[PDB]
Motif scaffolding. Sequence first.
Motif, PDB file in Angstrom:
ATOM      1  N   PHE A  39       0.754  -1.062  -0.168  1.00  0.00           N
ATOM      2  CA  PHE A  39      -0.287  -0.132   0.263  1.00  0.00           C
ATOM      3  C   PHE A  39       0.748   1.251  -0.159  1.00  0.00           C
ATOM      4  O   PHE A  39       1.794   1.287   0.644  1.00  0.00           O
ATOM      5  N   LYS A  40       0.395   2.418  -0.699  1.00  0.00           N
ATOM      6  CA  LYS A  40       0.926   3.655  -0.809  1.00  0.00           C
ATOM      7  C   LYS A  40      -0.222   4.627  -0.739  1.00  0.00           C
ATOM      8  O   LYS A  40      -1.382   4.697  -1.080  1.00  0.00           O
ATOM      9  N   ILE A  41       0.181   6.033  -0.375  1.00  0.00           N
ATOM     10  CA  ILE A  41      -0.481   7.281  -0.578  1.00  0.00           C
ATOM     11  C   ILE A  41       0.680   8.235  -1.330  1.00  0.00           C
ATOM     12  O   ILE A  41       1.613   8.595  -0.942  1.00  0.00           O
ATOM     13  N   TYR A  42       0.063   8.782  -2.314  1.00  0.00           N
ATOM     14  CA  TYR A  42       0.964  10.022  -3.010  1.00  0.00           C
ATOM     15  C   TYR A  42      -0.083  11.108  -3.220  1.00  0.00           C
ATOM     16  O   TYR A  42      -1.336  10.863  -3.411  1.00  0.00           O
ATOM     17  N   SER A  43       0.182  12.331  -2.899  1.00  0.00           N
ATOM     18  CA  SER A  43      -0.691  13.502  -3.073  1.00  0.00           C
ATOM     19  C   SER A  43      -0.268  14.796  -3.238  1.00  0.00           C
ATOM     20  O   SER A  43       0.906  15.188  -3.095  1.00  0.00           O
ATOM     21  N   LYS A  44      -0.960  15.724  -3.537  1.00  0.00           N
ATOM     22  CA  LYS A  44      -0.980  17.300  -3.642  1.00  0.00           C
ATOM     23  C   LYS A  44      -2.134  18.236  -3.509  1.00  0.00           C
ATOM     24  O   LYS A  44      -3.242  17.645  -3.712  1.00  0.00           O
ATOM     25  N   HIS A  45      -1.811  19.293  -2.740  1.00  0.00           N
ATOM     26  CA  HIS A  45      -2.889  20.331  -2.521  1.00  0.00           C
ATOM     27  C   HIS A  45      -2.636  21.528  -3.267  1.00  0.00           C
ATOM     28  O   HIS A  45      -1.448  21.950  -3.455  1.00  0.00           O
ATOM     29  N   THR A  46      -3.562  22.153  -4.050  1.00  0.00           N
ATOM     30  CA  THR A  46      -3.135  23.088  -5.144  1.00  0.00           C
ATOM     31  C   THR A  46      -4.308  24.104  -5.456  1.00  0.00           C
ATOM     32  O   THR A  46      -5.441  23.633  -5.136  1.00  0.00           O
ATOM     33  N   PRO A  47      -4.159  25.380  -5.778  1.00  0.00           N
ATOM     34  CA  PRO A  47      -4.946  26.304  -5.935  1.00  0.00           C
ATOM     35  C   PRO A  47      -5.619  26.126  -7.427  1.00  0.00           C
ATOM     36  O   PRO A  47      -4.824  25.713  -8.403  1.00  0.00           O
ATOM     37  N   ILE A  48      -6.853  26.512  -7.617  1.00  0.00           N
ATOM     38  CA  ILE A  48      -7.859  26.651  -8.867  1.00  0.00           C
ATOM     39  C   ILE A  48      -8.826  27.864  -8.872  1.00  0.00           C
ATOM     40  O   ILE A  48      -8.984  28.386  -7.555  1.00  0.00           O
ATOM     41  N   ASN A  49      -9.194  27.921 -10.039  1.00  0.00           N
ATOM     42  CA  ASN A  49     -10.104  29.376 -10.131  1.00  0.00           C
ATOM     43  C   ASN A  49     -11.524  29.075  -9.319  1.00  0.00           C
ATOM     44  O   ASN A  49     -12.094  27.952  -9.122  1.00  0.00           O
ATOM     45  N   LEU A  73     -12.425  19.207 -13.729  1.00  0.00           N
ATOM     46  CA  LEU A  73     -10.947  18.772 -13.504  1.00  0.00           C
ATOM     47  C   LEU A  73      -9.839  19.225 -14.444  1.00  0.00           C
ATOM     48  O   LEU A  73     -10.120  19.016 -15.562  1.00  0.00           O
ATOM     49  N   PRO A  74      -9.024  20.124 -13.724  1.00  0.00           N
ATOM     50  CA  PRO A  74      -8.396  21.137 -14.787  1.00  0.00           C
ATOM     51  C   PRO A  74      -7.261  20.368 -15.703  1.00  0.00           C
ATOM     52  O   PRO A  74      -6.690  19.451 -15.358  1.00  0.00           O
ATOM     53  N   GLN A  75      -7.120  20.998 -16.925  1.00  0.00           N
ATOM     54  CA  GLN A  75      -5.653  20.864 -17.698  1.00  0.00           C
ATOM     55  C   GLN A  75      -4.604  21.440 -16.799  1.00  0.00           C
ATOM     56  O   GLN A  75      -4.700  22.043 -15.616  1.00  0.00           O
ATOM     57  N   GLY A  76      -3.617  21.547 -17.685  1.00  0.00           N
ATOM     58  CA  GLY A  76      -2.241  21.879 -16.951  1.00  0.00           C
ATOM     59  C   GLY A  76      -1.543  20.719 -16.265  1.00  0.00           C
ATOM     60  O   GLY A  76      -2.120  19.398 -16.568  1.00  0.00           O
ATOM     61  N   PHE A  77      -0.701  20.875 -15.401  1.00  0.00           N
ATOM     62  CA  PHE A  77       0.159  19.790 -14.826  1.00  0.00           C
ATOM     63  C   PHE A  77       0.528  20.204 -13.243  1.00  0.00           C
ATOM     64  O   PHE A  77       0.439  20.996 -12.778  1.00  0.00           O
ATOM     65  N   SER A  78       0.697  18.980 -12.568  1.00  0.00           N
ATOM     66  CA  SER A  78       1.089  18.615 -11.450  1.00  0.00           C
ATOM     67  C   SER A  78       1.849  17.595 -10.956  1.00  0.00           C
ATOM     68  O   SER A  78       1.806  16.523 -11.861  1.00  0.00           O
ATOM     69  N   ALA A  79       2.523  17.709  -9.845  1.00  0.00           N
ATOM     70  CA  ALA A  79       3.244  16.351  -9.373  1.00  0.00           C
ATOM     71  C   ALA A  79       3.103  15.969  -7.911  1.00  0.00           C
ATOM     72  O   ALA A  79       2.944  17.006  -7.194  1.00  0.00           O
ATOM     73  N   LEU A  80       2.975  14.639  -7.466  1.00  0.00           N
ATOM     74  CA  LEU A  80       2.658  14.185  -6.233  1.00  0.00           C
ATOM     75  C   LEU A  80       3.685  13.645  -5.723  1.00  0.00           C
ATOM     76  O   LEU A  80       4.274  12.588  -5.985  1.00  0.00           O
ATOM     77  N   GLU A  81       3.915  14.170  -4.496  1.00  0.00           N
ATOM     78  CA  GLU A  81       5.050  13.326  -3.446  1.00  0.00           C
ATOM     79  C   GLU A  81       4.221  12.286  -2.794  1.00  0.00           C
ATOM     80  O   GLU A  81       3.123  12.332  -2.426  1.00  0.00           O
ATOM     81  N   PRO A  82       4.980  11.274  -2.153  1.00  0.00           N
ATOM     82  CA  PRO A  82       4.519  10.288  -1.472  1.00  0.00           C
ATOM     83  C   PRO A  82       4.388  11.066  -0.018  1.00  0.00           C
ATOM     84  O   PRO A  82       4.967  11.780   0.416  1.00  0.00           O
ATOM     85  N   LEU A  83       3.394  10.295   0.766  1.00  0.00           N
ATOM     86  CA  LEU A  83       3.205  10.704   2.357  1.00  0.00           C
ATOM     87  C   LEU A  83       3.286   9.271   2.996  1.00  0.00           C
ATOM     88  O   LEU A  83       3.612   9.242   4.240  1.00  0.00           O
ATOM     89  N   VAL A  84       2.630   8.101   2.607  1.00  0.00           N
ATOM     90  CA  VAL A  84       2.491   6.995   3.383  1.00  0.00           C
ATOM     91  C   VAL A  84       2.848   5.864   2.440  1.00  0.00           C
ATOM     92  O   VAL A  84       2.841   5.691   1.245  1.00  0.00           O
ATOM     93  N   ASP A  85       3.425   4.666   2.894  1.00  0.00           N
ATOM     94  CA  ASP A  85       3.963   3.756   2.420  1.00  0.00           C
ATOM     95  C   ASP A  85       3.998   2.275   3.368  1.00  0.00           C
ATOM     96  O   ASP A  85       4.832   2.322   4.378  1.00  0.00           O
ATOM     97  N   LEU A  86       2.991   1.284   3.310  1.00  0.00           N
ATOM     98  CA  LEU A  86       2.570   0.385   4.233  1.00  0.00           C
ATOM     99  C   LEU A  86       2.640  -1.023   4.171  1.00  0.00           C
ATOM    100  O   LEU A  86       1.801  -1.332   3.144  1.00  0.00           O
ATOM    101  N   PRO A  87       3.358  -2.002   4.544  1.00  0.00           N
ATOM    102  CA  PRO A  87       3.404  -3.353   4.086  1.00  0.00           C
ATOM    103  C   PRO A  87       2.069  -4.120   4.756  1.00  0.00           C
ATOM    104  O   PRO A  87       1.982  -5.518   5.084  1.00  0.00           O
ATOM    105  N   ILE A  88       1.137  -3.579   4.902  1.00  0.00           N
ATOM    106  CA  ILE A  88      -0.334  -4.077   5.792  1.00  0.00           C
ATOM    107  C   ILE A  88      -0.990  -4.958   4.875  1.00  0.00           C
ATOM    108  O   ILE A  88      -1.842  -5.729   5.551  1.00  0.00           O
ATOM    109  N   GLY A  89      -0.718  -4.999   3.509  1.00  0.00           N
ATOM    110  CA  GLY A  89      -0.815  -6.552   2.810  1.00  0.00           C
ATOM    111  C   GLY A  89      -2.466  -6.513   2.670  1.00  0.00           C
ATOM    112  O   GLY A  89      -3.003  -7.760   2.300  1.00  0.00           O
TER     113      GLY A  89
END
Lengths: 50, 40
Positions: free
Chosen positions: B2-12, B14-30
């Motif tokens: 299991f993993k989480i990657y995410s980003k929080h971002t401003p909008i006017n 689901l938009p065009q343009g580009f973004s990149a997500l950092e990891p937050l969580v990584d778990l061998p919970i299976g």
Amino acid sequence: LTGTGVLTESNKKFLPFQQFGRDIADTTDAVRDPQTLEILDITPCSFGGV
Amino acid sequence: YFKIYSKHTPINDLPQGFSALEPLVDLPIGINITRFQTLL
């Protein structure tokens, strides 16, 4: 990660999750100290044909 | 496993343009996930 180099503390902008970085050769370019937030560049010790 | 990657971002929608997500969580919970639901 066993190796050899000039360990220079460095301005490389590691993101908080990034533990080490790589050169184009896939060799390690830089590391974070496992006891400090400091990022260390690992320059190869100087070499050259004689 | 299991993993989480995410980003929080401003909008006017689901938009065009580009973004990149950092990891937050990584778990061998299976966990054998095949289904999910959202909480409000």
